[PDB]
């Protein structure tokens, strides 16, 4: 306890020795308190000017305007549960490890990742680049590094905002020890069977249709209420077992990340009463986002195999596993474990499961005792399943089967169109030039052309934005699945590569010659999913689109533009 976290606290105490007090009106119950000390979404004008009909749709316009789950506790699982998790976790790290080798990630790999801008959850230096291009940073890194090899920590402290930011250094040390899980694709579908890491939104619907082809019961897609808060100290121990597969320095650096920063956290939170609270806890998820995704995927795979074992009668009670049950659990994993992984699609806390039969629906004792309580259903009410893979929610989408005029089959991603338009009208951060705002609009437009071409309004609005932004300007994002739309290559060429040439579910490789060969949803179904077709507002927008394109061209100025509208039958004379 205080031996592991004391140093980090001690060091914070001294930097604010002027202001340190044990505040007695501290609002924490489950978070151990230690002391205190004194300390918006912007609109994208390019996308909004080209989506006028949505200016009067509150579900779009309200998206641009504007704890009691973190400060909760999770009971210790029973002995039977703890044994089921330990056996399953041991088995799963071995399967994931059969064709992969754990290894340290490099300064070079980190330096490259920071010099191409990604989600790093980081807070003497300004930007990430400067610190990476400074030897002093690496000496600070080196000091903590040697502290970790010595089994101690001084500067690895979380800052809450839920996202848990760290100083780049602590983030580097995290990356060095555990970055291999993402960098070497441990959660790819090929390696994990249930995972979808690196798949891409143009593959997820085909993956759910392949799960639907298995014999068995309904498709279950239960969401957990606040997954990150429900990660138990036991879950963190089972995750730590990945270190059993490591050696040398790597093994020691990884054991220190798990022991010192995951299983024993130190956090700073702003309270308006404005003070800084220094709190600690031993449970809950609070890594960096990328490691969080891989370990969430691992623990979710483990939890869903145990729920499958429960439905199949492999064990009778979570109170205690008998000696023979243990062997039966091990024998089930060796005999059918890989087949049962193949019946799932798991993306962090998000799952779809097609079990052997519907006994799964009421197999709730292990799931509830592991702390993975289902959202929006009563604790002991059986899960409701989906009879049709096209209705299943996954990764905030559903999926349509769409038949091309030439007979070939596309499985396409979809979500309510108000959500798509409302997100594309939002930027994050300050100091955006008009060029940078235009290039972010172009990134949304090209994503729409590639993923949501089947939605009449989005194909039209994507064509308009690409016509309104200079043809050679490069799409950008400030935080960056696989992003095939992030390119200045011709979008028809990219569509053909993604949906025909490289699509393993498409046997006929005949290229598509124009956008008019690429189908839409049915008119009614397109309207079900939030299309504004059949509204006078939408008809006037579509008719007068060249006027809207010309307004934006006039703002940006005298640049080289292409007209993409004649790619659509209605503007093609």
Ligand X SMILES: Cc1nn(C)c(C)c1NS(=O)(=O)c1cccc(F)c1
Residues that bind ligand X (CB under 6 A): 523-524, 527, 533-534
Segment (H or E) for 25: none
Q: Which residues contact 32 (CB under 8 A, 6 or more apart)?
A: 279, 280, 281
Helix 456-468 × helix 434-451 angle, to 10°: 150
Which of Cl ion, Zn ion, ligand X, none lies near 175, with the C-beta cut-off 5 to 8 A by kind? none
Distance CA 402, CA 206 (A): 12
- Classify burial at 558, counting beta carbons within 10 Å of its beta carbon; exposed 0-12, middle 13-18, buried 19 or more: exposed
Considering beta carbons, is residue 218 or 341 the nearer one to Cl ion? Answer: 218
| Residue from the set 466, 529, 542, 545 that interacts with Zn ion by CB under 5 A | 529
Q: From the CB of 444, what's the least distance to ligand X, in Å?
A: 24
Q: What is the dihedral of CA 243, 249, 250, 251, to 10 degrees?
A: 0
Report helix, strand and coil shares of the chain as percent, to nearest 5: 50, 10, 40
Q: From the CB of 402, what's the least distance to ligand X, in Å?
A: 17
Asked whether residue 227 is marked as a ligand-binding residue, the answer is yes
Q: Of 347, 277, 393, whose CA–CA distance to 20 is shortest? A: 277
Asked whether residue 144 is marked as a ligand-binding residue, the answer is yes
Considering beta carbons, is residue 170 or 548 the nearer one to Zn ion? Answer: 170
| Residue from the set 164, 172, 386, 444 that interacts with Cl ion by CB under 5 A | 386
Which of ligand X, Zn ion, Cl ion, none lies near 391, with the C-beta cut-off 5 to 8 A by kind? Cl ion
Asked whether residue 457 is marked as a ligand-binding residue, the answer is no
Q: CA angle, 210 as apex, 294 and 501 as ends, to 5°?
A: 90
Asked whether residue 351 is marked as a ligand-binding residue, the answer is no
- The answer to whether residue 156 forms part of the interface with Zn ion (CB under 5 A) is yes
Which of Zn ion, ligand X, Cl ion, none lies near 153, with the C-beta cut-off 5 to 8 A by kind? Zn ion
C-beta nearest to ligand X: residue: 534
Q: Of 500, 524, 520, whose CA–CA distance to 408 is shortest? A: 500
What are the angstrom distances between the C-alpha of 332 and each of 194, 214, 431, 513? 17, 18, 57, 51
Q: From the CB of 213, what's the least distance to Zn ion, in Å?
A: 21
Can you tell me which residue has the tokens 């130190």? 266
| Residue from the set 388, 490, 507, 508 that interacts with Cl ion by CB under 5 A | 388
State the number of binding residues for Zn ion (CB under 5 A): 5
| Residue from the set 19, 387, 514, 554 that interacts with Cl ion by CB under 5 A | 387
Asked whether residue 224 is marked as a ligand-binding residue, the answer is yes
Which of Cl ion, ligand X, Zn ion, none lies near 523, with the C-beta cut-off 5 to 8 A by kind? ligand X
- The answer to whether residue 399 forms part of the interface with Cl ion (CB under 5 A) is no
- Supply the DSSP string of 98-151, one letter for each residue: TT-------HHHHHHHHTT-----B---SSHHHHHT-HHHHHHHHHHHHHHHTT
Segment (H or E) for 37: none
Which of Zn ion, ligand X, Cl ion, none lies near 211, with the C-beta cut-off 5 to 8 A by kind? none
Considering beta carbons, is residue 117 or 527 the nearer one to ligand X? Answer: 527
Which of Cl ion, ligand X, Zn ion, none lies near 500, with the C-beta cut-off 5 to 8 A by kind? none
Asked whether residue 405 is marked as a ligand-binding residue, the answer is no
Q: From the CB of 302, what's the least distance to Zn ion, in Å?
A: 27
Asked whether residue 350 is marked as a ligand-binding residue, the answer is yes
Asked whether residue 400 is marked as a ligand-binding residue, the answer is yes
Q: CA angle, 489 as apex, 455 and 394 as ends, to 5°?
A: 40
- The answer to whether residue 391 forms part of the interface with Cl ion (CB under 5 A) is yes
In three-state secondary structure terms, 403 is: strand
Q: From the CB of 391, what's the least distance to Cl ion, in Å?
A: 4
Asked whether residue 483 is marked as a ligand-binding residue, the answer is no
Which of Cl ion, ligand X, Zn ion, none lies near 387, with the C-beta cut-off 5 to 8 A by kind? Cl ion
The pair of three-digit structure tokens given for residue 512, joined into one six-digit string? 């598509």
Q: From the CB of 545, what's the least distance to ligand X, in Å?
A: 16
Considering beta carbons, is residue 4 or 153 the nearer one to Zn ion? Answer: 153
Q: From the CB of 393, what's the least distance to Zn ion, in Å?
A: 11
Distance CA 467, CA 435 (A): 14
Which of ligand X, Zn ion, Cl ion, none lies near 298, with the C-beta cut-off 5 to 8 A by kind? none
Which alpha helices (DSSP H) does 215-364 contain, by range? 233-240, 248-256, 289-311, 323-341
- The answer to whether residue 153 forms part of the interface with Zn ion (CB under 5 A) is yes
Asked whether residue 439 is marked as a ligand-binding residue, the answer is no
Give the end-to-end CA distance of the chain in Å, rounded to a whole number. 75
Which of Zn ion, ligand X, Cl ion, none lies near 388, with the C-beta cut-off 5 to 8 A by kind? Cl ion
Asked whether residue 296 is marked as a ligand-binding residue, the answer is yes
Q: CA angle, 510 as apex, 505 and 512 as ends, to 5°?
A: 100
- The answer to whether residue 501 forms part of the interface with Cl ion (CB under 5 A) is no
HSE at residue 404, side-chain half, CA atoms within 13 A, is 20
Q: Of 570, 539, 554, 412, whose CA–CA distance to 52 is shortest? A: 539
Q: Which region among 185-193, 412-420, 491-499, 507-515 touches Zn ion (by CB under 5 A)?
A: 412-420
Asked whether residue 154 is marked as a ligand-binding residue, the answer is no
Which of ligand X, Cl ion, Zn ion, none lies near 317, with the C-beta cut-off 5 to 8 A by kind? none
Q: From the CB of 143, what's the least distance to Zn ion, in Å?
A: 10
In three-state secondary structure terms, 404 is: coil
Q: From the CB of 465, what's the least distance to ligand X, in Å?
A: 22
- The answer to whether residue 414 forms part of the interface with Zn ion (CB under 5 A) is yes
Which alpha helices (DSSP H) does 415-573 contain, by range? 417-424, 434-451, 456-468, 491-496, 523-528, 536-543, 545-556
Considering beta carbons, is residue 82 or 148 the nearer one to Zn ion? Answer: 148
Considering beta carbons, is residue 170 or 498 the nearer one to Zn ion? Answer: 170
Q: Which residues contact 45 (CB under 8 A, 6 or more apart)?
A: 437
Sequence ranges of the binding site for CTP = 226-228, 296, 375
Sequence ranges of the binding site = 144, 148, 153, 156, 223-224, 226-228, 296, 349-350, 375, 398, 400, 414, 529
Sequence ranges of the binding site for Zn(2+) = 144, 148, 153, 156, 398, 400, 414, 529
Sequence ranges of the binding site for Mg(2+) = 223-224, 349-350
Residues that bind Zn ion in the complex, under the rule CB under 5 A: 144, 153, 156, 414, 529
Residues that bind Cl ion in the complex, under the rule CB under 5 A: 386-388, 391
């Amino acid at each position: 306890n205080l031996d592991i976290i004391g140093k980090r606290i001690e060091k914070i105490k001294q930097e604010h020795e002027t202001s340190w007090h044990y505040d007695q009106d501290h609002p924490y119950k489950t978070w151990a308190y230690h002391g205190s000390y004194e300390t918006s979404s912007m609109v994208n004008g390019v996308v909004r000017l080209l989506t006028k009909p949505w200016d009067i749709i509150p579900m779009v316009t309200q998206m641009a305007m504007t704890k009691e789950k973190v400060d909760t506790r999770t009971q210790e699982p029973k002995e039977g549960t703890k044994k089921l998790m330990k056996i399953t976790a041991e088995w799963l790290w071995k399967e994931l490890g059969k064709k992969k080798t754990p290894r340290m990630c490099t300064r070079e790999e980190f330096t490259r990742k920071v010099r191409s801008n990604a989600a790093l959850g980081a807070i003497k230096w300004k930007s990430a680049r400067e610190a990476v291009e400074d030897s002093g940073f690496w000496e600070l890194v080196d000091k903590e590094r040697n502290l970790h090899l010595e089994g101690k920590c001084e500067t690895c402290v979380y800052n809450m905002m839920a996202i848990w930011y760290m100083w780049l250094g602590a983030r580097f040390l995290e990356f060095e020890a555990l970055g291999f899980l993402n960098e070497d694709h441990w959660f790819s579908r090929e390696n994990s069977l249930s995972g979808v890491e690196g798949e891409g939104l143009h593959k997820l619907g085909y993956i759910l249709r392949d799960v639907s082809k298995k014999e068995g019961g309904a498709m279950y897609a239960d969401d957990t209420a606040g997954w990150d808060t429900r990660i138990t100290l036991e879950d963190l121990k089972n995750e730590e077992m990945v270190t059993n597969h490591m050696e040398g320095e790597h093994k020691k650096l990884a054991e220190a990340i798990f022991k010192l920063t995951y299983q024993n956290k130190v956090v700073r939170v702003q309270r308006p009463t404005t003070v800084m609270d220094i709190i600690s806890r031993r449970d809950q998820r609070g890594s960096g986002q990328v490691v969080t995704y891989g370990l969430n995927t691992f623990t979710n795979m483990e939890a869903q195999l145990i729920r499958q074992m429960e439905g199949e009668g492999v064990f009778k009670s979570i109170q205690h596993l008998t000696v023979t049950e243990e062997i039966a659990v091990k024998n089930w994993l060796v005999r059918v474990g890989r087949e049962r992984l193949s019946r799932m699609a798991i993306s962090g806390d998000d799952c779809v499961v097609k079990p052997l039969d519907d006994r799964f629906a009421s197999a709730l004792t292990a799931l509830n005792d592991m702390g993975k309580v289902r959202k929006d259903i009563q604790q002991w009410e059986p899960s409701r399943g989906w009879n049709d893979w096209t209705q299943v929610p996954f990764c905030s989408h559903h999926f349509h089967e769409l038949i091309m005029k030439d007979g070939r089959v596309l499985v396409v991603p979809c979500r309510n169109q108000d959500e798509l338009i409302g997100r594309a009208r939002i930027s994050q951060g300050a100091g955006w030039s008009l060029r940078e705002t235009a290039c972010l609009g172009k990134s949304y437009a090209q994503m729409w052309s590639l993923m949501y071409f089947h939605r009449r309004d989005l194909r039209l609005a994507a064509n308009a934005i690409c016509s309104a932004v200079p043809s050679h300007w490069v799409p950008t994002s400030r935080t960056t699945a696989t992003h095939e739309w992030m390119t200045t290559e011709d979008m028809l060429t990219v569509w053909n590569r993604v949906w025909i040439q490289e699509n393993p579910w498409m046997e006929d490789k005949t290229p598509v010659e124009s956008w008019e060969e690429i189908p839409y949803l049915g008119k009614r179904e397109d309207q079900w999913c939030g299309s504004l077709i059949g509204l006078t507002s939408r008809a006037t927008w579509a008719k007068n689109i060249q006027t809207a394109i010309n307004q934006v061209r006039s703002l940006i100025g005298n640049e080289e533009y292409t007209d993409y509208m004649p790619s659509m039958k209605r503007f093609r004379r």
